[PDB]
Ligand SMILES: O=C(O)CNC(=O)C(=O)O
Ligand SMILES: [Mg+2]
Ligand code: NI
């Protein structure tokens with residue numbers, strides 16, 4: 001079996017290998033990349049997402065989210081407080097202000113220490129989940145706005161045409177902005193490109209061990225767990241690497257830098273944080289290997305998770321027994 005220890009793999013495709021997205025994902029999996037839950041892809045040196053980032057300041061962040069923590073330094077939840085709209089230019093200035101800027105540090109490791117020590121005592125503001133793209137229309141390879149849609153993949157595998165569309169999202173981050181432990185909707189893949197700015201550190205649990213994370217989470221967030229049998233779908237819980245190691249949870253970590261892609265694999269739990277002002281673009285996607293995961297994906301029906309229009313059809317076709325209850329939680 002390839003990659004039996006479930007290590008995060010890093011790939012360096014040539015320009016020729018960068019032409020066919022589906023084929024390259026399948027190549028990665030042939031080498032066992034999916035066992036880790038997350039892979040890094042460094043694009044060929046000839047490639048670029050767009051010419052420059054000099055003209056992005058007028059993008060609007062309609063609902064910036066202040067991420068307020070509760071709990072202890074290594075075991076906490078976060079809620080999102082809505083703030084007034086601001087432009088990317090305004091947000092970048094805020095990120096760089098003395099209140100929010102990245103502290104002095106020696107290296108990524110020192111910064112990770114400082115994150116886990118001090119995250120809970122600050123409430124950074126995240127410009128997340130903004131529909132849009134920063135890829136130039138003329139970028140033909142690994143353009144996240146031109147991938148094959150999940151609806152077309154389900155149609156090609158299963159024969160049923162469904163409604164829905166699939167478009168990318170922009171994330172403008174600052175120091176300590178945080179993504180809580182989650183898998184993707186319907187245990188989809190995701191792909192994330194860091195367009196500009198400071199790094200993003202990721203933590204991931206191998207898919208074959210995801211239930212171990214779920215069991216620990218039920219123990220560490222006992223009220224949440226009573227409220228919902230799939231409360232990690234709420235995307236609010238954080239558990240530090242120190243806590244995971246103490247509880248024997250298998251995981252890995254990696255830092256993504258500007259110009260690099262990350263791919264998360266079906267049922268690969270992941271969490272992380274931003275080092276300073278940055279902008280990432282991400283989208284979900286599917287392959288034939290996803291279908292079986294989609295069929296088995298847990299769902300939140302307590303009402304909290306509230307998701308896109310396009311998840312309806314996935315639940316309806318792949319999980320017809322669940323559909324009625326899940327839709328009650330949507331409505
Ligand atoms: O970048 C972030 O805040 C979160 N991204 C993801 O969880 C992803 O790309 O799957
Ligand atoms: Mg602009
Ligand atoms: Ni994700």
Ligand SMILES: [Zn+2]
Nearest residue numbers: 228300302304
């Ligand atoms: Zn729920």
